[PDB]
């Protein structure tokens, strides 16, 4: 079961938070109901996976927490099918935490929102300062310094080739055939 | 003086540019002003935030042609309106270059800063 | 006649966000400086971090000689001592299983987690199989 550590922390995701939290009553239901011998539960808390949020991944990792690639995370979950944990889950429901120690960063929403603001702000500043220094430069040194700085592009036109066979130099075609073939075949036949 | 005047040596522009202001309400826009090399500060740490700077700009320009300028001279002190309404010269404008096509300083203050006096007009001019 | 084994060798990546001069945010999955295979990955997971503190080295020819690395695929590496040993004291690894207490909560257990990471390491080195498993 892909249960999250996100239980009304981030918010603004409808019932995602109540859907994943409710998946976690299966641990008590596995003892208190009959179906224990047919299904075993191996509830996995799925941590921060990459592949929106991917920009700030570096930022959050600087806290000494680990985010995962899809590959990494898929390796972790396949870890939960090795015969050792299968025996384990059969004995009693397994609760795996693949969160990468993200549960320890306090105010994860506020700390994420702080990281997005700091990266977006700097991105828009440098965008604005870069374009306002570009229009100033163009005012001072006219459009003539920027039309001679502009390069003419060349767009490819269809050149539909008949694709005749590529004829090698005689030396190369003489190697692939046996040397004894010369004047052996009637070329009329 | 009507006619044709190949007078590129004897020419000069020495106009007293309007005292523009610029309000520093925000930090992304003081960063824009600080990027401009011409804004020389006496105290380089002076917190400009939440102030009204004014610019005693006066621009001299030599011409090599009837459009392109031969050299640009932008100087003049920069003041800050204090809450007690006694300004002080906290900076200097000093813009120097060769082949100019327009004062960027004045061009800057034209869009980013504002003219002190803005004449308002009528909906309908009164035929006196 | 040996079972087919899920073994990954792909170079693990980390996140690298760069702002150029013109304020363009570019994201990239970049070769992790330290972690350059799955065995190492599991050892980084095992050690955990500073915030996860509550209160082995193998030579290879990956990214240099493919042929020798291929040669050392069917040769199943015996582990001297497992990564479960190298989990620091009063340190919760990044990957860990929990156990329900008598009180009725889920806390980190070292034994189960020790068993899980041993599993992982073994997959990383030798590879897990799932022959006759319907999913």
Swiss-Prot record, chain A:
Q: What's the superkingdom here?
A: Eukaryota
Residues that bear Phosphoserine: 130
Q: Known post-translational modifications?
A: 4'-phosphopantetheine is transferred from CoA to a specific serine of the Acyl carrier domain by the C-terminal PPT domain. This modification is essential for activity because fatty acids are bound in thioester linkage to the sulfhydryl of the prosthetic group.
Q: What does this protein do?
A: Fatty acid synthetase catalyzes the formation of long-chain fatty acids from acetyl-CoA, malonyl-CoA and NADPH. The alpha subunit contains domains for: acyl carrier protein, 3-oxoacyl-[acyl-carrier-protein] reductase, and 3-oxoacyl-[acyl-carrier-protein] synthase. This subunit coordinates the binding of the six beta subunits to the enzyme complex.
Q: How does it assemble?
A: [Alpha(6)beta(6)] hexamers of two multifunctional subunits (alpha and beta).
Family classification? Belongs to the thiolase-like superfamily. Fungal fatty acid synthetase subunit alpha family.
Q: What else is known?
A: Present with 17000 molecules/cell in log phase SD medium.
Q: What is this protein called?
A: Fatty acid synthase subunit alpha
Q: Which residues of the full protein are shown?
A: 824 to 1017 of 1887
From Swiss-Prot, chain B:
Recorded superkingdom:
Eukaryota
Other noteworthy facts: Present with 91800 molecules/cell in log phase SD medium.
Q: What does this protein do?
A: Fatty acid synthetase catalyzes the formation of long-chain fatty acids from acetyl-CoA, malonyl-CoA and NADPH. The beta subunit contains domains for: [acyl-carrier-protein] acetyltransferase and malonyltransferase, S-acyl fatty acid synthase thioesterase, enoyl-[acyl-carrier-protein] reductase, and 3-hydroxypalmitoyl-[acyl-carrier-protein] dehydratase.
Family recorded in the similarity comment: Belongs to the fungal fatty acid synthetase subunit beta family.
Give the multimer and partner information. Answer: [Alpha(6)beta(6)] hexamers of two multifunctional subunits (alpha and beta).
Q: What protein am I looking at? A: Fatty acid synthase subunit beta
What organism does the UniProt record list as the source? Saccharomyces cerevisiae (strain ATCC 204508 / S288c) (Baker's yeast)
């Amino acid at each position: 079961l892909p249960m999250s550590p996100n239980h009304g922390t981030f918010g603004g995701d409808g019932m995602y938070s109540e859907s994943k939290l409710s998946l976690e009553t299966l641990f008590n239901r596995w003892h208190s109901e009959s179906w224990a011998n047919q299904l075993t539960v191996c509830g996995a808390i799925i941590g921060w996976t990459r592949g929106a949020n991917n920009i700030i991944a570096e930022g959050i990792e600087k806290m000494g927490v680990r985010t995962f690639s899809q590959k990494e995370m898929a390796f972790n979950l396949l870890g939960l099918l090795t015969p050792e944990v299968v025996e384990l889950c059969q004995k009693s429901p397994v609760m795996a935490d693949l969160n990468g120690g993200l549960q320890f960063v306090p105010e994860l929403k506020e700390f994420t929102a702080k990281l997005r603001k700091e990266l977006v702000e700097t991105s828009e500043v440098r965008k604005a300062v870069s374009i306002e220094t570009a229009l100033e430069h163009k005012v001072v040194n006219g459009n003539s310094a920027d039309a001679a700085y502009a390069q003419v592009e060349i767009q490819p036109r269809a050149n539909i080739q008949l694709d005749f066979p590529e004829l090698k130099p005689y030396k190369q075609v003489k190697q692939i055939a046996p040397a004894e073939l010369e004047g052996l075949l009637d070329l009329e036949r | 003086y009507r006619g044709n005047y190949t007078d590129f040596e004897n020419t000069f522009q020495k106009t007293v540019e309007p005292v523009y202001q610029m309000h520093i309400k925000t930090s992304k826009d003081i960063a824009v002003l600080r990027s401009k090399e011409w804004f020389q500060l006496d105290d380089e740490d002076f917190d400009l935030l939440n102030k009204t700077l004014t610019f005693e700009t006066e621009t001299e320009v030599t011409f090599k042609n009837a459009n392109i300028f031969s050299s640009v001279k932008c100087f003049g002190p920069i003041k800050v309106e204090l809450p007690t309404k006694e300004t002080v010269e906290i900076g200097i404008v000093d813009y120097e270059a060769g082949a100019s096509h327009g004062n960027p300083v004045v061009d800057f203050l034209k869009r980013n800063g504002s003219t002190l006096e803005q004449k308002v007009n009528l909906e309908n001019p009164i035929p006196i | 006649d040996v079972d087919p084994v899920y073994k990954d060798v792909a170079k693990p990546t980390g996140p690298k966000t760069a702002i150029d001069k013109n304020g363009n945010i570019t994201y990239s999955e970049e070769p992790r400086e330290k972690v350059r295979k799955l065995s190492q990955y599991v050892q980084e997971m095992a050690l955990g971090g500073p915030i996860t503190k509550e209160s082995m080295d193998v030579e290879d020819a990956l990214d240099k000689d493919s042929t020798k690395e291929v040669a050392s695929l069917p040769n199943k590496s015996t582990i001297s001592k497992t990564v479960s040993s190298t989990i620091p004291r009063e340190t919760i690894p990044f990957l860990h299983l929990r156990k329900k207490t008598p009180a009725g909560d889920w806390k980190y257990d070292r034994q189960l987690s020790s068993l899980f990471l041993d599993g992982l390491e073994k997959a990383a080195f030798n590879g897990v199989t799932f022959k006759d498993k319907y999913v």
